[PDB]
Symmetry: C3
Subunit: 258 residues, 3 copies
């Protein structure tokens, strides 16, 4: 609340600071908020009484962190980069890596301001700022955890899986993968879609806000949400004339914990 | 003009010099064309009076730069590489970065000989040699702009998007994404297909030269070109017997100046 | 020959030594097998008189190298990592690279314990431990060769192609791409499926073990194996009611742009 209030008020008067002219009270709080997102003590969105709630002042902190830091050079011995977001693990000691319990397989990179819990294995992949990856989740090769995405415990994002980042609109739920979910390879969950815990997404399943998700047992079509324990494979739905088919996600069976 | 003619005659005589016994006259000209591709003053393909034109002599210069350079080790502090194409930003000063207006988000890599304009953001991704990326375009995570590809102004290549490189057929227009285009995630536009300005490609759309492109209003089938302002989602077309359907790209709407991504795809 | 038996008995009694209290007989042998997989003299699977055989003790050696090594920091000048598997080309001299005939395009990475043969081109991509990539094969941008996967001679893995890794169950043939195959972009061949030589997979084809493979001329549905010289495109099969269609891989011909 005391830190939260300084962030929100700084965001209201944000057309008055640059990376050069900004009072150090505001830099300290934004730096304080990024640090909290980075070690998981803060999170962009959490589940309160079964509903995911977005904490906008942390999205505002992330935006302010862009406003107040210019691009600086980032140097590999022969490769160079240029960005305003530090990488998460730069300058980390060996004692720090051991303590976090996260395996960062080269060339994996996470942005500072994202959280990975103990026993997360980052294969070559990318985790963007504001994301939270919970204990025991495997991020496989060339997978992407987008900004502010919330990934549950013991989640498997198979290779080439993209979890779409949602930063703006400030009122928007980020993309959420709940506990014990398997996302098959080359799949893409974007635009704030929620996959409820225990689901099994086959390979090649693309789910956005416009993506129709057909329940082949009920015939009902819902959007933006994969119900818990769904087994979702890619398919198509025919048109009225049967001259073409449009893409759809098909729920083919349902399974509780046991 | 004098350089255009110089490259071509040496390309005809490429069977007479190698990376070692190349006259330093030949090495200086390729670097000038490579340098021009890298800062955007030359481009493998440009649009002239509404028609896209390929400058084959620039494809020939790129090929020659492969012949005249051997592989050299490339050193990150603990990871090693080995290639004959320099990366674009090695040795770049902070002043060079500032002036170019390009964000290179680590571990993004572009090869030297490609161009990115101001306000281009390269998320972790690869831009290959001979490609041109114009003002304000977002190249997202694990995207690929292949060799000689031309990406327009204010384009969004979503994550996992592949723009296939076209070098081999010298006479072919490379793959072109025209201005104000959205390419959704895990999509692939290859083999010189053209996407005309203002189009909106949903996730999971693969378009090559062989790919059927179905206009659901007209019944027309296009190849190699997405007409301007098309909204394309992936779909299927039934076979003659209806025992199966084969992959196809479906045009489901057409628009003028209407740009909502998520409601425009429903 | 004597080395294979040392690995297997260490694997059978692996609940009795750790990375700290490990007898040097067992650690010396696991390192010898990792060394051998890296230069191609050993392979997790090879083709013998037309039959592919898996050498399970090499899968067991790979596991032990995970067991016997802790995570260490891995540093680029400004980027840092933390892992127990070393990089393949780390510390390689310029003469070492020249000798191997592999181009490693930055930022491509292979893990130590994997093999790439002459005239293999690694675009930015990943090769996992235990995989074998044979002479003249092109691995394109953001492609993945999973662990123990065997890729044949003169194969093209297009951009974004994933070849699925198989480590456990030990008796499993890994994922195998046979000689002279073209895998189109955004494709995924996983779970030990074999693609027989001369096949052509279009863009956007996903093949796991559960994936239906429809031969549109015979009407027969095959699983887990692509017959040699097949041309495979992505498609759909209708359900009994025709209210929907589900994913399947369709064979449209058997034998470059004219094929698909």
């Amino acid at each position: 609340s005391q830190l939260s209030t300084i962030i929100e008020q700084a965001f209201e008067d944000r057309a008055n600071f640059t990376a050069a002219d900004c009072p150090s009270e505001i830099r300290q709080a934004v730096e304080e908020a990024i640090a909290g997102l980075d070690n998981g003590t803060l999170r962009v969105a959490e589940k309160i009484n079964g509903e995911w709630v977005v904490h906008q002042w942390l999205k505002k902190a992330v935006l302010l962190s862009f406003k107040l830091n210019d691009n600086k050079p980032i140097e590999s011995c022969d490769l160079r980069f240029y960005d305003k977001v530090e990488t998460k693990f730069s300058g980390w000691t060996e004692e720090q890596f051991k303590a976090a319990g996260v395996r960062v397989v080269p060339p994996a990179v996470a942005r500072r301001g994202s959280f990975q819990a103990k026993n997360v294995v980052l294969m070559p992949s990318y985790v963007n700022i504001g994301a939270y990856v919970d204990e025991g989740t495997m991020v496989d090769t060339w997978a992407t955890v987008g900004s502010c995405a919330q990934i549950g415990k013991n989640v498997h994002l198979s290779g080439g899986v993209g979890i779409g980042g949602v930063l703006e609109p400030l009122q928007a739920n980020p993309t959420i993968i709940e506990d014990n979910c398997f996302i098959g390879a080359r799949s893409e969950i974007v635009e704030g879609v929620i996959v409820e815990e225990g689901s099994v997404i086959s390979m090649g399943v693309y789910i956005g806000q416009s993506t129709r998700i057909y329940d082949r047992e009920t015939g009902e079509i819902h959007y933006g949400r994969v119900p818990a324990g769904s087994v979702v494979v890619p398919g198509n739905l025919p048109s009225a004339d049967g001259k073409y088919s449009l893409y759809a996600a098909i729920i083919v069976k349902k399974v509780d914990a046991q």
